[PDB]
């Protein structure tokens with residue numbers, strides 16, 4: 001069985017790795033095994049002197065703090081975003097662009113970006129006067145919490161995977177991870193996309209064709225939209241993967257809508273299981289969010305992402321075709 005798992009983990013560089021099998025094959029440890037595999041693939045343990053037992057211990061603690069009883073925002077989603085970010089980092093148009101520390105930041109940020117998600121939206125947490133919303137003053141409530149939890153777990157026993165980074169290295173990594181995870185809040189998406197469009201329109205490259213990033217502002221914005229793309233990459237995956245993601249997000253949305261209905265609150269969009277159009281919501285999701293973003297990212301790394309954009313447009317047509 002580890003033989004099969006080890007074979008499925010050979011695909012870790014491929015879009016459309018079957019992350020759900022890896023979840024089953026790994027005993028519901030997709031985040032640990034995929035993270036461990038990717039760190040070995042990128043030689044990160046050696047570059048940053050990460051003891052392997054420390055890495056495993058942190059990853060398993062971190063994975064434990066995703067909710068097994070939340071349908072979408074769980075450790076499988078975390079593993080999938082880690083692995084999608086890992087592929088996006090390897091695109092030819094970005095070769096030698098980012099430092100090891102920046103690569104570490106983006107992969108780490110992807111691993112922690114939804115930890116301890118309770119399965120309800122920011123607006124729900126605000127409207128129900130939750131402790132989370134009270135702590136974080138209604139601003140990117142979930143995303144601030146994911147960060148706090150992700151960094152806090154580094155202090156548990158034998159969990160500081162960054163123990164051998166220099167002081168300046170940790171400082172920079174910490175700031176970069178915060179900037180990246182706060183960018184996963186959808187309230188930031190329009191401004192993020194506008195900057196990405198502006199960068200594409202004014203795009204600069206080097207002699208060897210690779211993207212040229214002069215300054216922190218441009219470098220972090222690319223890493224922010226990269227992880228954001230990976231977060232919104234479900235409709236770009238092979239359809240049998242996409243559809244299982246759609247099942248999971250809709251079940252989590254419906255359960256929030258049930259709570260909203262129990263409390264006499266207005267039901268959030270797409271959360272009313274008695275008035276839901278799964279298919280229409282996926283088409284609108286693609287048309288108004290995912291395709292605008294992925295089309296702009298494809299422009300940035302053209303033509304590296306042509307196949308991923310083709311898949312997204314095929315999946316959009318397929319969900320559209322299923323509207324009665």
Ligand SMILES: CCn1c(=O)c2c(c3ccc(C)nc31)O[C@@](C)(CCO)C[C@H]2C=C(C)C
Pocket residue numbers: 184185186231234235245246249250270281282285289
């Ligand atoms: C049902 C359609 N749908 C969404 O509406 C949303 C998705 C999402 C993810 C996967 C699939 C398949 N569908 C999704 O992800 C979010 C929650 C992840 C990042 O916060 C973005 C949320 C989008 C909003 C609220 C405009």
Ligand SMILES: [Mg+2]
Pocket residue numbers: 113114142184185
């Ligand atoms: Mg999130």
Ligand SMILES: [Zn+2]
Pocket residue numbers: 077081113114184231
């Ligand atoms: Zn997410």
